[PDB]
Amino acid sequence: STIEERVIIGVKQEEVTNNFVEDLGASLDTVELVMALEEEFDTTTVQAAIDYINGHQ
Amino acid sequence: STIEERVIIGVKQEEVTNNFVEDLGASLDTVELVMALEEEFDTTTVQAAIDYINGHQ
Amino acid sequence: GFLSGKRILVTGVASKLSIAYGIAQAMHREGAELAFTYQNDKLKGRVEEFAAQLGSDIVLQCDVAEDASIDTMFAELGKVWPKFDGFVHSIGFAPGDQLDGDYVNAVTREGFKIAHDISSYSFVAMAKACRSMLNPGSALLTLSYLGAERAIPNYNVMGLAKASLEANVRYMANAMGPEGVRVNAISAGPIRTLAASGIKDFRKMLAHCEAVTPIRRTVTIEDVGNSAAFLCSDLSAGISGEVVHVDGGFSIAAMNEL
Amino acid sequence: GFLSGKRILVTGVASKLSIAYGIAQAMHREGAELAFTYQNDKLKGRVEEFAAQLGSDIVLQCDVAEDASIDTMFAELGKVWPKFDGFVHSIGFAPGDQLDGDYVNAVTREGFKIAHDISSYSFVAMAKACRSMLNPGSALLTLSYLGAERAIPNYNVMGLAKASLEANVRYMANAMGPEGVRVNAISAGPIRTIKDFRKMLAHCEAVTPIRRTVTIEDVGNSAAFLCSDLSAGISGEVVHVDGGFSIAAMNEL
Amino acid sequence: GFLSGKRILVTGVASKLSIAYGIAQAMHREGAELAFTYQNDKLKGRVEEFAAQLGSDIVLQCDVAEDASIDTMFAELGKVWPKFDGFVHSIGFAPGDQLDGDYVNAVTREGFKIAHDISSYSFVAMAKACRSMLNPGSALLTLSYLGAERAIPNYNVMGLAKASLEANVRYMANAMGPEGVRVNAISAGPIRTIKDFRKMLAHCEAVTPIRRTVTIEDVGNSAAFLCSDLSAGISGEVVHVDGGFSIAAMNEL
Amino acid sequence: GFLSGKRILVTGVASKLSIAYGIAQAMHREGAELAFTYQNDKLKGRVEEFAAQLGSDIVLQCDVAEDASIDTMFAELGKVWPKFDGFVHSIGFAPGDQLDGDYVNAVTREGFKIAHDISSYSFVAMAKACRSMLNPGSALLTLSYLGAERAIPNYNVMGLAKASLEANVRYMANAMGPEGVRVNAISAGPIRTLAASGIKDFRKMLAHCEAVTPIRRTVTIEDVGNSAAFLCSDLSAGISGEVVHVDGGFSIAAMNEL
C-alpha cells in the first residue's frame, strides 16, 4: 500500500482520479470519509489522498 | 289540576290514554319521567297516573 | 410534579366543570406555575377566584378577536414572565344560529369567518405574539372535537373550523419545531356539564354515547386534564403535530348499536 | 358516454393547462353538457374560446367572494338550465405573501380570512345558492391537496383552508345526501402545470408509486367518474389522485 | 365502453347476488373480456352459468390456500391470455366461531392464521403468481370493509385481516407501480346481500348520507372505474363505497 | 411516581439501547413494580441483570409462538402476582429474507404467517391468557411503526403485520374496555442503536430523517419510555384504542426536502 495505493478512500476505481464533493463524487456523505481514513492511518478535491495524509504522521 | 289532569306525564294529548313502555310510548326515556313527576308532587302501563300517585302522599 | 419548572398560560377558564379548568387543576397539581386570561370585564371575578385557588396572581384580560389585545396581553404578561413554557388554547366560538339544524341552510359567510377566526386563527395569532418569549422545551396545546373528522349533526361550521385548527396544529408544529416548541391537540369526547345536564337531547345523547364508548363511560375533565398536563410536560418530548383522541375509544368503534 | 344527460357547471377554467380544463374536457368527451364561469372581464374572451372548444356557449361572470355575484350567476344559469346536475369547484387563493417562508411568520389574520373564504367557504356558498336547482343524482366536486393532511413548506395557510374544505365536503355530503345530492373531493398530486419546482417534481416522479406525476387528464377522468352515476355509492370522500404519492414514505431511502 | 381491450380475471363469483358478480357485470357492460375462478367442484356449474351470461367461457379451478392451485390456475389462464390486464380479488374467510361474540374470547391462533392467510395473503399470493403476465396499465383490486379501520362487534379477527389487506394494497402498489401496475381497494358499505341483520341495515340506511345502502351495482361501477384507464392517477388507495356512512358520526342524535 | 401501585409485565427487553428497556426504565422510575419475560435460555443472564437493576426478581421464560408457553408463564407469574395491572408488548419478527428488497418478490406465505403470528397475534394471545388476572384500571400497550400506514421500502410484510397489530389494538380495546382494561399503541419514530449505527444506509437515513422531523431530531428511547409510562398510568384513563405517534412529528410532514 503506497502513498497513492492506500488512501480506503462511492466511486469506480478508474473514475476515482487522484486529481471529493465536485468531480470525483466521493449532505453527510463526505463526513464519514474522514472518520474512515482517520481509523486506518491512526492519526476541496481528492488532493489530501497524498498532501495532508503523508507529511502529517 | 285533577287526579287525571295533573299526572307533566313524548306523546299526543289524545293518544296518551289513561289506560308507559308498550302502547302509550311515554332505554333511558322512561327514567327521567319518574324524576319529573317526583318533583311536581314533591313525594308497566300509565296506571300510576292515578293509582300509586294519589294514595301515596 | 412533572410540570415543576413550567410556566403555562391557560385560556378560556370560566367554570369549574369544564375542560379548561380540569387542565389548569391538573397542571397546578403537577407543580406548574400558571397564568390565566379572561374575555370581557364582567368575568375578572370568577377567573381571579379560580386562579387564586390554583396559586396564581396572574390574571389578564384578552380578546383574541383583536391582534391589539393579544400583543397588549403578552406585553403585560411579559412583566411578571419575561420568558415562559407554553399555553393552552381553549377558545372556540360560532354565532349561535350556525349550530342550528341543516348545515348548508345554517351556514353563512359571516358564521364561517367568525368560527374560523376565533376557533382556529386565534391559536396561531397567540403563537405569533409570544414566539420569542417561548423557551426551548416549550409546548402548545389546543382543544378539538370529532366533528373535525366526521360530519356530526348540528356541529355544522364548527367541524370545518376544528379541521382548520387540526391543520394549524400540524403547520405550527412544523414551523415552531426547529426552535424547540412542540404543538399538539387533544380531541376530547363529550363531557357532562350543567349545560349538557340541561337538555333531554344531550342527556339521552351522553347516555347513549356511554353505552357505545369502549371504556363504558364519558371521559372526565380530569381525564382530559391529565393528558393535557402530559402533553405540555417534557414527558411528551417525542410528540408533536399530533391530535390525541381522548374519548375513551369512542371514535375507533362503529356499529356498537351506535 | 357515462355523463350523457347531465348538466355540469365548471369553475376555474383559466388556461388549456388548468386542472379545471382537463375536467371539462373529460366530461365533454363523456357526453356532458357544460357551463363555465369566469372571474373578471380580462379572462372573459379566453373562457369563451375554451367553452366553445368544449361544446358550450353558457359562460357566466362570477366572483365567489361576493354573495351577490354567486346569486346572480345562478339566476342567469337559471334561464338556460332551470335544473342542472352539479358543479365542479376548482377555486383556491391566498394572498401571495402568505405562501412563502415560515408559516407562523407569514400567516396573518387577513390572509387566513381570505384563504378560508375563497378556498373553502365559496364551495358551500355555491351549493347554498343552487340547492333547489339540483336534481336527485346530482354530484358536487372540489379540488384539494395533501397540504390539507400534512404540513408542507410554503403551502402555509392554504393547508388550513384545504383542511376546512375537506371537512366542508363531509358536512355538505351529510346535509344534501337526503335529497339525492353527493359531494366529494379529489386530492390531486402535484402536476407540472425559479428552480423551486423543477427539482421538486423530479424527486416527486421518483417516489410516487406510478413513477410519474399525474396529468390534468388523470384528474379529469377521476373527476368525470365522481360526477357521474358510476360513483353513486361514493359520497363525502376525499379521493387521492396522486399516483400513490401520499401512501408512500421514506422511499428516498 | 371504458374497459374495451382489457382482460380481467374475477374471483369470488358465487351467486348472482355476489359483490363479485356486480363487478363482473359492470365490466362486461363496459367492454371487458372476462375470466372467472371457482373454489370447488360443487360450484363449478353455477360459475359456468354466470361466466356465460357475462360473455366468457374461461373458468378455472382455484384454491388460494394452496400455492400450487394458484400457480396452476395462472398457468392454465396462460394458454388463453398469455398477458392480461389485472384481476379482482373478492375473497374473504374466517372460521365461523371467530365471527361471534367477544373478540378476545372468540379469537384463536388458528382462526387468526386462516383469516389473514385467505383474506389478506391470498391477494399478494396471486399478484406474485401473475406478475410477468400483467401488461403495463394493469390494475388489481380487492374488497375491504370498515371493520379494518374501526372495531365492529362480531367482525372480530376479520378486522385485523382486512387491516392487513389494506396495508397489502399499499405495499403492492408501491412494489408493482414502477412496471405500470396499479393496486387499490374498495371498502364497501354493508349490502342487503335471524333479526341480526334486518334491524342493522334499517338503522344503516338512516345514518348513511345517501339514505340507502349500496348495491352490488354501485360497487361494480366503482370497481370497473378502478380497473380501467380512467383511474390511471389512483393507486394504493382504499376508496370508501358506502354512501358516506363512515364519514358520519352520532347521527342518531 | 405516577405508576406507584402498578405491576407491569414487560416483554422483549434485551438491550439497554432499545425501546423496551427505555420503557421499563421509565416505568421503574415512576415507581412501578416490574416483571420481565425472555426468549431462549441463553438470555436469562442479561435480562436478569436488567431486571435486578430495575428492582425486580421476576424474570420468566416465554415463547409466544406457543400457546402452552404463554399459559405456563402466566401460571408462574401468578405465584408472585395473583392479579396485576397490564403489560407492554414489545415483540415483532419477520424471517429475515422478507425484509430484503421488492415486497412482492420477497414475501411468501410462510413469511406472512410468522410475521403476523409473532408481531400481531402474540399481542392478543397474551391478553387472552391473563384476562382475569387483570385489575380494573389496567392498561395494555404495544409498539408499532409508520410502516403500518404507509409503504416503506424493505419494511415489506412487517407493514401488514403492524397494520394487523394496530387493528388488534382497536378490537382489543373494544372487547376489554367493558371490564376496565385500556389497550393502546405507540407508533415510534426510528431510533439510533448500535445496529443502526452499523450501516451507511441506516446512518445516512437516520441523519436525513433528523433534518425533516419537525422537532429536528429522532425521538429517544427515553421519549418513548415516558409516553409509554403515561399510556399505562391512570393519567391516560381517557385514552383507549388509540395509536399515539411518537416520532417528533415526522409522519405529519411531507415534502420537507423529505
UniProtKB/Swiss-Prot annotation, chains A, B:
Record localization: Cytoplasm
In this UniProt entry, the residues modified to O-(pantetheine 4'-phosphoryl)serine are: 27
Q: Give the record's PTM text.
A: 4'-phosphopantetheine is transferred from CoA to a specific serine of apo-ACP by AcpS. This modification is essential for activity because fatty acids are bound in thioester linkage to the sulfhydryl of the prosthetic group.
An annotated GO cellular component of this protein is: cytosol
Instruction: List the molecular function annotations (GO) for this entry.
Output: acyl binding; acyl carrier activity; lipid binding; phosphopantetheine binding
Key word tRNA processing present in the record? no
Task: List the InterPro entries.
Answer: ACP, ACP-like_sf, PP-bd_ACP, Ppantetheine_attach_site
Q: Which keywords describe this protein according to UniProt?
A: Cytoplasm, Fatty acid biosynthesis, Fatty acid metabolism, Lipid biosynthesis, Lipid metabolism, Phosphopantetheine, Phosphoprotein
Q: In which pathway does it act?
A: Lipid metabolism; fatty acid biosynthesis
Please give the superkingdom of this protein's source: Bacteria
Which residue intervals define the domain Carrier in the entry? 1-57
What GO terms in the biological process aspect are recorded for it? fatty acid biosynthetic process; lipid A biosynthetic process; lipid biosynthetic process; response to xenobiotic stimulus
Role of this protein: Carrier of the growing fatty acid chain in fatty acid biosynthesis.
Q: NCBIfam families this protein is in?
A: acyl_carrier (TIGR00517), PRK00982.1-2 (NF002148), PRK00982.1-3 (NF002149), PRK00982.1-4 (NF002150), PRK00982.1-5 (NF002151)
User: HAMAP family of this UniProt entry?
Assistant: Acyl_carrier (MF_01217)
What family does this chain come from, according to its entry? Belongs to the acyl carrier protein (ACP) family.
Instruction: Fill in the subunit field for this protein.
Output: Interacts with MukB.
- State the name under which the record lists this protein: Acyl carrier protein
Species of the source: Escherichia coli (strain K12)
